[PDB]
Each structure stands twice: as structure tokens, then as C-alpha cells.
Amino acid sequence: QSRAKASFDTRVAAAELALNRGVVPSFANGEELLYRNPDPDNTDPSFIASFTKGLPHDDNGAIIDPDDFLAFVRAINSGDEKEIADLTLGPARDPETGLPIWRSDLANSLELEVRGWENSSAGLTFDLEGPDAQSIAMPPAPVLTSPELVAEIAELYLMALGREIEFSEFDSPKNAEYIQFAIDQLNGLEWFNTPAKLGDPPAEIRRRRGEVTVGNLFRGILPGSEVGPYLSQYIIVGSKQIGSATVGNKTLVSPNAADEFDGEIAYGSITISQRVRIATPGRDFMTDLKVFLDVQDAADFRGFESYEPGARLIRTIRDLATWVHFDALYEAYLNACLILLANGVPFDPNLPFQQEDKLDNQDVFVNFGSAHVLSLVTEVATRALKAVRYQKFNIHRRLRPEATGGLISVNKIAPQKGESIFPEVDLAVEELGDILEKAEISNRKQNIADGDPDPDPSFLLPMAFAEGSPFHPSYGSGHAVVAGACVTILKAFFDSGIEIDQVFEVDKDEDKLVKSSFKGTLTVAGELNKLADNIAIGRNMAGVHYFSDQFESLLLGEQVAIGILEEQSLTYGENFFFNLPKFDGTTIQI
């Protein structure tokens, strides 16, 4: 047949394959319509559990008009630019200047404008590769009354309180008090001490975590993230630099060979420094109710974060939060791919032409080579993002962990002021009494530092970012969907079972890599899973994402990547497959 018709039939075959996977229905937790206005004479939904950021809020963090959220959902579903623009974004605007009237003095003095919902209808966008954004689904988000939400927001609060704690010193006695406090608080929660019961949803059982120890504290559940040092090699260590190649019987050493152990990735002929910008230690955001409410009302606080001069390898929890703050979509995975290519980590042996050229007479760059994996790991990200945008906006609309912390803080302040509000987060408030007390101390210190001499007792989740979360619902996680997709691509493409001989950690005292005390072995698959978990949990340590968004959008991204790979496999005439170890421990051949 003709080459043009052959290409058309290949594309139609890939589209038919995407069709044949079917559309997995997407089920929400029911919190959108479950919780109503606490007013005895108002039956409208409160939408407190829904992502209502941008829509005007009352002083308690609840929507003023549920019609605002209903129109927001209508705009999400329609996708029309005019209808999205017709949405009420932000608070009432000042008649004189046209600027929104902010509740906090900080946002008013800054003359902050509103920030819009980032791609409220990207889930309606179609894709020419991979599953449709709406074809694959995410399980229902944890409900606020669930012990899973309690454990999630507890992990978020402990991550916020431990943002200055260095990863290499999780086991160190200098952080022992806080680490043991967090471990014993999480292990005091039903979600961590009590196992899943028979009849729980498969996703609920699968994402349920066991006893929290120092070895898995603030860690993931993907295989290989809990094994070894906390941070992935690909986020801290560099790569074999230019000049360190093997030429026949002679091995040349790069004059810059120390850059591999200085956290410098050979980015072609230039270098990528793994060192992250140092966000100001101890500076948390949205710890005051007025600033938090302004952020809920779309206060564009983006870029307001202060940073220390220079850069360093990720050591503190805040360092990982900063890393996941600005990463260029596929940054972590593209960097992992660059490390694996420069380190000469072999591709999947089931790829063609991966032998020595004495045997196959064929090197691999465009297909089954460097360029192929570099392009796949980067193109999977936007389609996983479209899928997660569908999950965020059209299906779940889960409130951000900042919004949960706001509900929790208002609920905890209400008895102090004599009322009772947000009984939905009553379980969260009671089960995290000590965590919330530590958070209140931290928020008092921050609000004194912010400028309030006598700050109102605030139990808001401290935010690593001034704007807090990105302006979309928490469930699922875009960074974690890109994590799943890109790490899935890399594991399928590279020989993911290859063990990493040299395992590094960030030095506890200095800003350099040290050989990890980990006496076990780390695989490429294990460290890629660790990198995906690192980015995802770094989103958690920013206060912008719960753990379920993380893990279920990691699964969703893995599904998106599997679909993309399955469709692109129809385009290569070579006899081959991708040996892909999935996040459940199974290996699929694509």
C-alpha cells in the first residue's frame, strides 16, 4: 500500500487502539454536593470540600455564592473562553482603581491582581497520542470525614513543620524530636495503624500506607522509593561529563569528571546543575487567615517567595518543595534521562539495535536511542497533564490542602470565638490536636515575622509557596501525573533493572554529594520510581497536594504513558517491545 495511506492507517490504528482501551468512568467522592450551608435556612451546597479558589469566599473560607462554583463547573465543562471569562474570579473589585479589595493588608498594599484558573478545560483538549484525557480515570478522592484525609493533612502539616529538616538527617538525632513526633502522630492515625478492611475500594487498599517509620517517613509507595536514601540519584547526582567516554581499549576521563559527583548533569555539551534555588528557611506562607482568604480569592502571590543567594543540592524538605515549585513540566525526568544517557545506562535490551554495532550494524538515536527517549519522556507529559486536568476540573474538583487547612483552622478557631463551623473537618481537628498545636506555634511565629505583633491563633497549613497551590484542584496532581508518565516512559525505554553501583546522598554538613551508607542495591527502575515519588511528595511538602492525589495521579500518568507507548509501538516496523515494570510490580511489554 501507499506510504501516505500507510501513515494514515497507522494513525487510525493507534486511534482505534485508544478507542479499544475504552473510557474508564471517573467517579468523584460526592463531597461536591454532600456538604451544605450550615445556615439553618439555606440548603445550598457549601462546596467547602470543592476547589473554590478564585471564587469569592466568606471570612471562614467558604464560598459566598454557590452559584459562583456552579458557573465555574459549567465553564469547566463547556470550555468556552467567554464563559470562563464570565466567571467571578476574585473578590469585589474597588470602584476607584478597579483592583480587587483584598482582606489582608499584605495583598492590598501589593495591589495584587487576581490569578485565573490554569487550564480549567485542558481536560476537554484531545490528544493525538495516548489515552484521551477523559478515557482513563482516577478513583474518588478521599473525603474530608475519612481517616484518609486526616492522615493526608497530618502528613502535610508535619511536612510543613519539618520543611527546614534535611533529608540526610531524617535519622539524625538533631531532628529526632520532630521526626519521632511526626512518626508517632502518623502512626496514631487510623489510616496508618489500622490496615485496609475487606470491601474497601481497590485504590483505597492499594494507596493505604502501613506503619510510618523513619525509613518511609514522607516517602512514597511505588517500588524503589522506600529503598535507599530518600532522594533519587537523578535529582541530586550529576552525570558522566563530556570527555569521559570509552574509546576502544582506552578510557578517557573528563577533565570535569568531578561534576558527576558535584551534581552536574552533562546536558549535551553544556551542564545542568542539580542545585536548587534556596528558598528562605522558615518562611512559610498563608499562615494568616486574611492572606489565606485572599489567596482563596485568587490573590496572585506568585513570585512573592524570598530566596537565599546561590543554589544547593536538595537537602531540606523545603528544598524539595522549591524544586517542585518551578520545574519545567518534565524537568526531573528529562534530567533523569540525561543522566542515564550520559552515564551510559543501557536502553531496554528488548529494543532493537541495542547490541554492539559489530553485531547489529546499527546505532540508535532517533528510534530506540537517545533522541527517542528524550522526546517520549517530554511528549508524554502534556498528555498526562491533559488527563490530570480533566480529573482536577471536570471530575473531582478536590479542595487544595491549603483549603483543607483553612477549613481545619476555622473549625479549630470557632470554639475559641464561641461558634461551631465546618463539622466536616471535625475528625481532622480532633485527630491532629498536637500537630495542629505545633502548626499554631509555627503560624504564630510566621505571622509575627510577617508583621502582625499579636497574630490571631491560626492553624492554617504552612505553605512553601506564597501563592500556595497552583490554581487548579488538588486531585489529581499534575506534577505527579507527569511523574508517573515520564518515569514510566524512562523505565520502559531504559534498562530499568540496571543496578546503580554508586549511590549518593547530600552531605549532612556540606553542600556536596557523599556516598550513601545504604548497603543495598538501587536499580534504575527503583531510582526512577524514587524520583517520581520525590517530585510528587515534594508537591506534598509544599502544602499543595495530598498523598492520594500524588499516588493516584502517578498511576494515572503511568496509564497515560502505557497508552502512548502502545500507540507509538504501532509506528515502528522493528520487532521489539518496551519491558516496562509498572508501579504495581508487574512488567508489561509494549
Residue choice 27, 267, 304, 353 for contact with Ca ion (CB under 5 A) = 353
> Minimum CB separation from ligand VO4 for residue 12, in Å?
31
Question: If DSSP codes are grouped into helix, strand and coil, which group holds residue 81?
Answer: helix
Residue choice 200, 308, 357, 419 for contact with Ca ion (CB under 5 A) = 357
Does 478 carry a binding-site annotation? yes
Residues 6+ apart with CB under 8 A from 248: none
Alpha-carbon gap, residue 475 to 113, rounded angstroms: 26
Q: How many C-beta atoms lie closer than 10 Å to residue 588's C-beta?
A: 16
Q: How many C-beta atoms lie closer than 10 Å to residue 497's C-beta?
A: 15
Residue with cell 541530586: 236
- What is each CA distance from 314 to 70, 191, 235, 533, 538, in whole angstroms? 41, 29, 8, 14, 11
Q: Which does 269 bind (CB under 5 to 8 A by kind): Ca ion, ligand VO4, a copy of itself, none?
A: a copy of itself
Q: How many C-beta atoms lie closer than 10 Å to residue 534's C-beta?
A: 28
Q: Is 53 in the site for ligand VO4 (CB under 6 A)?
A: no
Q: Which does 358 bind (CB under 5 to 8 A by kind): Ca ion, ligand VO4, a copy of itself, none?
A: a copy of itself
Stretch that binds ligand VO4, among 22-30, 252-260, 327-335, 471-479 (CB under 6 A): 471-479
Q: Is 477 in the site for ligand VO4 (CB under 6 A)?
A: yes
Q: Which does 429 bind (CB under 5 to 8 A by kind): Ca ion, ligand VO4, a copy of itself, none?
A: none
551/576 with CB nearer ligand VO4: 551
Q: Which does 544 bind (CB under 5 to 8 A by kind): a copy of itself, ligand VO4, Ca ion, none?
A: ligand VO4
One of 57, 325, 372, 472 is an active-site residue; which one? 472
- What is each CA distance from 575 to 16, 493, 569, in whole angstroms? 21, 15, 10
Helix (H) or strand (E) holding 324: helix 317-326
Residue choice 221, 432, 544, 555 for contact with ligand VO4 (CB under 6 A) = 544
> Minimum CB separation from ligand VO4 for residue 380, in Å?
16
Contact 61, 296 (CB under 8 A): yes
261/353 with CB nearer a copy of itself: 353
For residue 265, report the phi and psi dihedrals to the nearest 5 degrees.
-90, 130
One of 325, 372, 396, 479 is an active-site residue; which one? 479
Contact 295, 301 (CB under 8 A): yes
Contact 432, 426 (CB under 8 A): no
Q: Of the candidates 487, 477, 298, 296, which has an alpha carbon nearest to the alpha carbon of residue 389?
A: 477
Does 109 carry a binding-site annotation? no
- What is each CA distance from 54 to 23, 153, 185, 458, 473, in whole angstroms? 31, 22, 33, 21, 11
Q: Of the candidates 24, 133, 34, which has an alpha carbon nearest to the alpha carbon of residue 79?
A: 133
User: How many residues belong to the site for ligand VO4 (CB under 6 A)?
Assistant: 10
332/436 with CB nearer a copy of itself: 332
Stretch that binds ligand VO4, among 31-39, 369-377, 430-438, 538-546 (CB under 6 A): 538-546
Cell digits of residue 4: 501516505
Give the N- to C-terminal CA distance of the chain in Å, as an integer: 25
- Is 479 labeled as catalytic in the residue annotation? yes
> Minimum CB separation from ligand VO4 for residue 534, in Å?
13
- Is 57 labeled as catalytic in the residue annotation? no
Does 318 carry a binding-site annotation? no
Interaction mask 359-378, Ca ion, x per CB under 5 A:
-x------------------
Does 539 carry a binding-site annotation? yes
Stretch that binds ligand VO4, among 129-137, 205-213, 230-238, 466-474 (CB under 6 A): 466-474
Annotated binding site for vanadate: 392, 400, 477-479, 539, 545
Contact set with ligand VO4 (CB under 6 A): 469-470, 472, 477-480, 539, 544-545
Which residues belong to the active site?
472, 479
